[PDB]
Amino acid sequence: CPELAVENASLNCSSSDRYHGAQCTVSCRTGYVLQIRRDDELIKSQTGPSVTVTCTEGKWNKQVACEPVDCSIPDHHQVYAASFSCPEGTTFGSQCSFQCRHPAQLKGNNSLLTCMEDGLWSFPEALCELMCLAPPPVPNADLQTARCRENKHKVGSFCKYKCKPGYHVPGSSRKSKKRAFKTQCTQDGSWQEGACVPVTCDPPPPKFHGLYQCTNGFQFNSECRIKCLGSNVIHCRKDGTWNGSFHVVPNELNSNLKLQCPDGYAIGSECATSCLDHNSESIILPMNVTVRDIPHWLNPTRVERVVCTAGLKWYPHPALIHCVKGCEPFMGDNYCDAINNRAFCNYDGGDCCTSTVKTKKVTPFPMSCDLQGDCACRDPQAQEHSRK
Amino acid sequence: PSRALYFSGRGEQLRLRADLELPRDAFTLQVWLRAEGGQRSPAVITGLYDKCSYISRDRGWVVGIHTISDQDNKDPRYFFSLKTDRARQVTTINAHRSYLPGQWVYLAATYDGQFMKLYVNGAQVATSGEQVGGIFSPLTQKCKVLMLGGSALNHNYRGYIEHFSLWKVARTQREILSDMETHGAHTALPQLLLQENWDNVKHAWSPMKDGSSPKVEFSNAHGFLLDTSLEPPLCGQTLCDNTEVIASYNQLSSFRQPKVVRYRVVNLYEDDHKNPTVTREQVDFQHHQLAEAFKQYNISWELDVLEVSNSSLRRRLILANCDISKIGDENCDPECNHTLTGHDGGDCRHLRHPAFVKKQHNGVCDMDCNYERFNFDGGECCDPEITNVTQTCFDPDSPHRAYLDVNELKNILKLDGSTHLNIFFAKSSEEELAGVATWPWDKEALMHLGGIVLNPSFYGMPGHTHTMIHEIGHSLGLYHVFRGISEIQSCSDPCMETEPSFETGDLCNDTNPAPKHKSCGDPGPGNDTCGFHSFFNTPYNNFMSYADDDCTDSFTPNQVARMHCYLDLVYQGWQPSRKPAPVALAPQVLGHTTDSVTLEWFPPIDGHFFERELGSACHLCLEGRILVQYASNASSPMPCSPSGHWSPREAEGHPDVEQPCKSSVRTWSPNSAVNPHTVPPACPEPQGCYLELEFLYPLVPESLTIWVTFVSTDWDSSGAVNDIKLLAVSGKNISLGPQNVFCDVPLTIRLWDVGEEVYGIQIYTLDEHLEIDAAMLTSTADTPLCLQCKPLKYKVVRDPPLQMDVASILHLNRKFVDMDLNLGSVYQYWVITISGTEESEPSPAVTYIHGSGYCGDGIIQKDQGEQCDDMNKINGDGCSLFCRQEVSFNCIDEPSRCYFHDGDGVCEEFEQKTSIKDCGVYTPQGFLDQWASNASVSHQDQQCPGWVIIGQPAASQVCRTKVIDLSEGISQHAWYPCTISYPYSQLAQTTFWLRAYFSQPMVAAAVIVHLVTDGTYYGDQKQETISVQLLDTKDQSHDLGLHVLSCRNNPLIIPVVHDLSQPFYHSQAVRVSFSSPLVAISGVALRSFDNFDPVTLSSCQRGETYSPAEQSCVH
Amino acid sequence: LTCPEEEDTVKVVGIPGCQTCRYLLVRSLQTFSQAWFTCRRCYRGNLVSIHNFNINYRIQCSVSALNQGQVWIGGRITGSGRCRRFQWVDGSRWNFAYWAAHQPWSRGGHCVALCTRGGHWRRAHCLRRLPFICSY
Ligand SMILES: *[C@@H]1O[C@H](CO)[C@@H](O[C@@H]2O[C@H](CO)[C@@H](O)[C@H](O)[C@H]2NC(C)=O)[C@H](O)[C@H]1NC(C)=O
Ligand SMILES: *[C@@H]1O[C@H](CO)[C@@H](O)[C@H](O)[C@H]1NC(C)=O
Ligand SMILES: *[C@@H]1O[C@H](CO)[C@@H](O)[C@H](O)[C@H]1NC(C)=O
Ligand SMILES: *[C@@H]1O[C@H](CO)[C@@H](O)[C@H](O)[C@H]1NC(C)=O
Ligand SMILES: *[C@@H]1O[C@H](CO)[C@@H](O)[C@H](O)[C@H]1NC(C)=O
Ligand SMILES: *[C@@H]1O[C@H](CO)[C@@H](O)[C@H](O)[C@H]1NC(C)=O
Ligand SMILES: *[C@@H]1O[C@H](CO)[C@@H](O)[C@H](O)[C@H]1NC(C)=O
Ligand SMILES: *[C@@H]1O[C@H](CO)[C@@H](O)[C@H](O)[C@H]1NC(C)=O
Ligand SMILES: *[C@@H]1O[C@H](CO)[C@@H](O)[C@H](O)[C@H]1NC(C)=O
Ligand SMILES: *[C@@H]1O[C@H](CO)[C@@H](O)[C@H](O)[C@H]1NC(C)=O
Ligand SMILES: *[C@@H]1O[C@H](CO)[C@@H](O)[C@H](O)[C@H]1NC(C)=O
Ligand SMILES: [Ca+2]
Ligand SMILES: [Ca+2]
Ligand SMILES: [Ca+2]
Ligand SMILES: [Ca+2]
Ligand SMILES: [Ca+2]
Ligand SMILES: [Ca+2]
Ligand SMILES: [Ca+2]
Ligand SMILES: [Zn+2]
């Protein structure tokens, strides 16, 4: 039998004489992982180090190799806010260096990691400490806590920014006019985000729409001047009201639109708008939003009546009014549908999301629908879309 | 004394004081804890957490109680999870069993640096080596915190903590046992980092500021030395089904003394007391035959005949096994086939057409239109004025109808079943047997709803006299002889007796396994039985088989032992002789000094610790004076009818569900009682549907358990039980909070400062599918209703007799020390139970040699049948109190420390054949196993890949049986037909095959097919077979037969029977053919001879002899 | 209207319970009222009223081959109050109910459909186009 040399291992033989029928035990050193293979046969490595090999027919039945134990390429979660340079590799006995980011501070003596015998990088003897600096300023908002003005803070606490009376986070209800919020220093050294946008006061009534030229549109403390006894000069107040209000056949129809007038074509009359198609609804389309490609997060303004303006024109112009595919009546029937999974049809009444369907299990009307695609949950109120 | 901490689930949690230094390299946590019933899902008993900031969470170890299946919440086990500061994963190890929700458990969790181990009650139940190195560096030592009884996210724990201790070094298992015994101080050890007898909680622990603090009580945790709770087997029901109790009843003949059992015959008369149900002649003849058959087996019967004068009940038919809801349905039930029934409502008549035509009612009733398909003639036939009610009204919806059920007759009569065996009479059209006799372990066995239902027309008939003896044996705990063959769910049932045994089948060793047949001999072929073709020494002459009445004549002695043991256990009220129940087990030796010995014995087989009084509540009082009682009067509001208040007779007695996490008829649902036509409403939103459970004896409670059986699978709210309102006799309601419940274990609530008496509870639910099986109330330690009760005394007799001072004494407690022993004498002890002055039968004798050993000395003695010997007499560990090691445990040292080995990672020499999870599939020394490569199947699909058979199979996958839907998690390990379902295969018959090829064409000694599914449908109850064939290199096929699948033959072995005259053939492929599309094949192995290949050796010509050493022709 | 072609209709018969009950499964997609009129005209009977588990299991074995998950059986919710009453369309009494998980109390439509996978019933909207089974 030939001599078998195994790298990075200690080999023993119970007999000095070598012949066909003699076996030798090979044990690999600590910090090395066995790889027992054969000819077109990749077998799993032995947990123990004791493997005995016997020569057969003048040949060796297998090959014994022992690689260095490989630690993973240094993770972001191994040491946070640092970069790793390991020119020696990731083998056993190798060393790697880590250096922190510019906001983070390296505190300690040695800043080295070592792929050790057990297969993991060693403990970092120095720490990268992340310190949150001063937040960026928020327009129309004021800081409250005096320690948030300082450039030193801990990671994960809150700092309060209060908006002006009238300015608030968008989506604030009319009854609960909360005018403040908080931002938290996140793990990346930045802060949370929030801006006080003006959503208070109301757009003018639809009988005088069109000729307004406001400073900020329909927003809070914006002055709308219709260009022509009082005039069209109105100022919004703090509590959410103004000081006054404005004063003084459509042949371009849609493919299904019908305008029924109970009052005729007189000035100020309101006429009912309907779509002659049974499964269609009249909406106001934006110019960049086509008929077939309305996004699922878009809620178009539904049309109820055509009302005359001060220029003797109809504010809901029927040319601008599109009769689009309306909501099928299978809403709230514990049935996820591809048609009504959009903001136009109330996300099918929540039938496509598991926390909101009354049977608490999503069922598609055609069983061959895309569960993660066309028939998927898209509701931001659900706990699937929410990060909690 | 000992002091304990009670944590409720409200957020009471502690943290360690920062002056202490936490362990980094190795640690050991030892905690005595008494967990409560219903827990939060990731409950944390003790954890170590990082309080630096949000960086790399779940780093640090946490011990607690959590479910194995997170998406199901079924099986809650103790767990220990560790993730060091260097590892990229968190390893969680679990115990071997669900946690006991009322017992003290000594949890120990050790970690040295390469092996994390979890010990429950001193037995190693988990080990892992996937965590290596220290836990955290000294640099990050400043922001680690040790939490007790909770987490940072409030993963709180309910129950008691008694003896907390944390060590900085990994204790060995013997040191774990030594610290379990020593409940005092380990203060001499420098490595003892912390120990906490709770004299001063606030010194070393601090609570959370918004949270509260745990309560401080007394424990008495180490309160008993002998575990007196003996468990029934998997196929058993009560204490009598245990092997040791039934062994002492089979061996000692003083337990089989003659008894007199009262039984009552209930025959209905008319109003003038003229027309009976049975005559007096057949009553006397049946009594003579019954006294003849039971005289040899030491059971005498005393006959009471009770006449009931009721012409309304006498004229109405009584249906034994006919459900009322099975009348109008279109299938023909053979049970409800009677003239007064209406030929199953007309659904068994041949001229029935399915066209439901409702005729307009006009005048008189017609018999041809009194069927179900003609609406029972529009209700004319049920009118009392038009015709007689008792012969024409077949409508089950009508209140006055022609038929009646036996349970309705039992509710009408409402007899005293606590003192007599009631015999009821009902008809049976199928005439295979009589009605269902109530088992002794049923809740109705001592109620008015229990007894024996017979056919009165065959009662006392000279050819039908043995059916009453059969039903009487059914009511005394005897199953049918054919229970382990034909009365099983599938071929993989654990109670299918392949051999005579005391734990499989009908729990009788003297009854060989047999199928059901009407013949008086051994059966022929085995077309229905799974793995058996023929049966020999079949008990055809037994009373419990289905043989003819000229064949059945005898009871086996094991059946007589079961009958006497069930007469002593549950049927003490049926006997006029007031001799008390004996102590069924031998007295156990607990310890000895140099000149004395200590004995402790079990409670008597009745289970009662007090004397019997008829007009009292002394039959509920326990070993102290705690009155443990169950519900007696349930009340829930009917949803459709306001102020209805139907009374559920389920959820009253002891809990009696078999599958603990399945929908059952033995429980209460919120809308169980509504008719199918009325829409069952959702429960009210603010409170929920509620059940009012009233107890018979109002008292001051201390504990309350509710056996919630079924919860909704996708519940998605937080809690099932909404709130529990205790009803007091003063009118106050005490509202407990929302309760987390588990499917398997009960919900146990400890009650604090309930000064007033409580007569009932109300359980509120927001779940429409909740099932409640029972409710148990446990009073305080001195109930005023148990003060009048007088306890049983025990008298100890020694075979070398005691002195006259010692021998005449009577013991209140179950402990006896004697110090009159000589150094080499052999003594025998037994104990007689003395209730008043009347004694019981003696217990089995325990033989004690004062020089030698016993079963509590810690020395393994192989001559006395000791597999292991601890020093505890506790069944919780791996070694029982009868010196027998338990299932899937192994004990090593001479003081036996036992470890769980079936779920281990390493393989030992004693588990290669059985532990398929740890070791490989056991191939013998003369053989080799080659697994398949490139297996081609019949029904390829995207969802079922069809290449999963290639390579070694998944041996760790649990074999599944009676499974309706296979699409959960088994497609990653095996191939089944994805395209065809079981109903579609039931419609269109087809054949599914799997062809597997091998790289090296060998000679097939055997074919090993690995399955992870039995192939049986959930509702078909039909066994399934496979047809394995061998395919040679010349494309010939060799049939290997039809083989019945089981989960007990999980590496299924098909041997090849090859005649030696034929040449040996190389086999290349194997074709596994089957009919059921629910069979999943993880792998197919070809087993060949390891030493030689006979196909190559036979090819060797003249002069070339064989060589198995190099496997070639040599010349 | 138009009677469904027999290429889209299968016959289910041979129940292990009754021997006279025969059913006809039309795979054409129709609403509830149109299915009721189609069964009542072209085949002279109402929709199938299921009274036992054998009929329901044979129906499930017949309809498990369909692409659609739901078929029509003739059950309606005819009631107004705290507890409505289910009614079969053929006028037979409602004694057997085989519902799915959380089915009758979870609102939905006013018609009854049968799931093809499992056989459990389900409250469904009456304007859904589903296959339907007629008794005849
Ligand atoms: C029925 O009880 C009698 C006792 O009244 C039992 O008779 C004893 O039988 C044993 C052997 O089995 C003898 O050693 C005793 O001497 C007998 N005692 C008497 C008083 O005769 C009899 O074995 C019991 N039979 C059964 C089937 O249990
Ligand atoms: C032995 O260790 C060296 C160290 O880098 C490695 O390159 C070599 O592959 C190892 N030997 C074997 C057989 O793997
Ligand atoms: C007879 O049976 C009826 C039930 O049918 C029951 O109401 C009544 O109390 C019984 N007794 C008499 C004396 O009528
Ligand atoms: C019993 O059932 C058969 C059919 O199984 C039926 O023909 C007969 O009418 C029924 N009743 C009697 C009394 O035989
Ligand atoms: C029962 O019916 C018969 C004939 O139908 C009638 O003569 C008899 O009076 C009836 N019995 C009663 C109690 O009404
Ligand atoms: C059980 O029955 C067998 C025969 O099948 C017999 O050999 C054995 O002694 C019996 N008893 C026990 C305790 O096994
Ligand atoms: C086949 O098994 C059944 C058990 O259900 C039995 O009744 C029947 O007699 C058996 N057939 C033969 C030929 O033994
Ligand atoms: C059970 O309670 C109900 C209502 O509380 C009452 O009507 C009934 O009589 C009670 N029954 C018993 C046996 O206490
Ligand atoms: C107790 O329940 C009664 C009704 O049973 C109710 O009137 C009363 O307000 C309740 N009291 C408390 C404190 O819950
Ligand atoms: C058993 O315990 C003690 C003996 O230490 C004594 O009170 C009496 O013998 C027994 N007590 C009771 C309560 O049975
Ligand atoms: C299996 O055999 C077929 C037939 O030659 C071949 O196309 C395929 O690549 C094979 N697959 C494997 C995994 O060997
Ligand atoms: Ca029937
Ligand atoms: Ca009539
Ligand atoms: Ca047996
Ligand atoms: Ca119950
Ligand atoms: Ca011993
Ligand atoms: Ca023990
Ligand atoms: Ca093992
Ligand atoms: Zn029987």
Numbering used by the authors:
A (entry chain D): 1135 to 1362, 1371 to 1390, 1400 to 1539
B (entry chain C): 13 to 1127
C (entry chain A): 87 to 222
Publication excerpt:
Originally discovered in the circulation of pregnant women as a protein secreted by placental trophoblasts, the metalloprotease pregnancy-associated plasma protein A (PAPP-A) is also widely expressed by many other tissues. It cleaves insulin-like growth factor-binding proteins (IGFBPs) to increase the bioavailability of IGFs and plays essential roles in multiple growth-promoting processes. While the vast majority of the circulatory PAPP-A in pregnancy is proteolytically inactive due to covalent inhibition by proform of eosinophil major basic protein (proMBP), the activity of PAPP-A can also be covalently inhibited by another less characterized modulator, stanniocalcin-2 (STC2). Here we present two cryo-EM structures of endogenous purified PAPP-A in complex with either proMBP or STC2. Both modulators form 2:2 heterotetramer with PAPP-A and establish extensive interactions with multiple domains of PAPP-A that are distal to the catalytic cleft.
To assess the molecular mechanism(s) subserving PAPP-A activity and the modulation of proMBP, we purified endogenous PAPP-A·proMBP complex from pregnant human plasma and determined its cryo-EM structure. The cryo-EM analysis generated an initial dimeric 3D map at 3.64 Å resolution, and C2-symmetry expansion was subsequently applied to obtain a final 3.45-Å monomeric half map, which enabled de novo modeling of most of the PAPP-A residues. The density at the interface between proMBP and PAPP-A was sufficiently resolved to analyze the detailed interaction. Besides, plenty of glycosylation sites could be unambiguously assigned, and a few coordinated Ca2+ ions could be identified. The structure not only confirmed intramolecular disulfide bonds of PAPP-A reported in previous studies, but also identified several new disulfide pairs. In addition to the previously reported covalent linkage between PAPP-A-Cys652 and proMBP-Cys16932, we also found that several other residues of PAPP-A in this region, such as Asn683 and His689, contribute to the stabilization of this interface. In the PAPP-A·proMBP complex, the binding of proMBP induces a nearly 30° rotation of the βBD towards the PD, generating an interface between the βBD and the C-terminal subdomain of PD. The mature form of proMBP is known to bind heparin; and in the PAPP-A·proMBP complex, this binding site is partially blocked by the CTD interaction.
